[PDB]
Amino acid sequence: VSAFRELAESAFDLMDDATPDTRRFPKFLMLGLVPLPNQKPEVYALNSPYRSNFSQSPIYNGNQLRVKQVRFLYDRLVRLCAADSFYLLPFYDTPLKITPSKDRAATLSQQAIPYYLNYPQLYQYWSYDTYRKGRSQSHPAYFYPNNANITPNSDLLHRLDDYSFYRIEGHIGEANATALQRILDYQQRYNLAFDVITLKIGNLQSFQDINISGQFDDLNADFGRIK
């Protein structure tokens, strides 16, 4: 749905008219309907129903770029709606990873590419402005392409100013304690800030599972110390 919207908000402003036709209204101009007596004339609308509205060649107002963005957006949608775009890998072949990104309010093109997608075919064609500069191989994502001199983990070593969301992937399907411990160690290696808790689905309590949730550590620390 997000991709859909990104398209329809853009194409709403496009005016191209690449090849005019001189036979449209060759020797006259039509004006709108005559309003009711003593009514105010319409002064906000751009396109009245039966008026001879203005149309231009795709040079002005920046259309020479929109004519392309809209295209590049429409084509992207067609790839998202394909048979093999929802494409997961067996959970024991996905090590943990944390990647910074922008929040859900941002345009879809500015977000990190989620890892349940078929990366080798969608890593091109994610964002147009990145495409222009030749930097599509470095967008924040879970995979990186082969035969490109990419330092493995450059995101979390260099200054972090324009990111606000930590997207965390690699945890689904594992055991509780393993996932929790790996997340904590990844916190420690690269100095990131957030809390972690775990919860159970059900209505009956189990044995010693309270030792996993993010309580009984203000106390367990002292027990371990004296132990």
Shortest spacing between CB 78 and another protein, in angstroms = 17
Using the minimum distance from each CB to another protein, give the nearer residue, 11 or 172: 11
Q: Draw the binding track, 99-138, toward another protein (x: CB under 8 A; -: no contact).
A: ----------------------------------xxx---
In whole angstroms, how close is the CB of 169 to another protein at the nearest point? 26
SS (H, E, C) 196-227: CCCCCCCCCCCCCHHHCCCCCCCCHHHHHHHC
**98: number of CA atoms within 13 Å, CB side?**
20
Q: How far is the CB of 171 from another protein (least distance, A)?
A: 32
Please tell me what DSSP assigns to residue 19: S
Report helix, strand or coil for 14. coil
Map residues 30-59 to x or -, x wherever contact with another protein holds by CB under 8 A.
xxxxxxxxxx-xxx---x-xxxxxxxxxxx
Task: Identify the three-state secondary structure at position 13.
Answer: coil
Q: Which is nearer to another protein, 132 or 189 (CB)?
A: 132
Q: Decide if residue 159 touches another protein (CB under 8 A).
A: no
- Bridge partners of residue 100, in order along the sequence: 166
For another protein (CB under 8 A), the number of binding residues is 43
Nearer to another protein, 81 or 219 (CB): 81
Contact yes or no for 67/126 (Cβ under 8 A): no
DSSP string, 93-132: G---EEEEE--TTS-GGGS-B-TTB-HHHHSTTS-HHHHH
- Least distance between another protein and beta carbon 162 (Å): 15
Beta carbon of residue 34, minimum distance to another protein (angstroms, whole number)? 5
Tell whether residue 81 is a contact of another protein (CB under 8 A).
no
H or E element, residue 81: none
Q: What is the dihedral of CA 163, 2, 173, 191, to 10 degrees?
A: 0
Q: Which residues bind another protein (CB under 8 A)?
A: 8, 12, 17-39, 41-43, 47, 49-59, 133-135
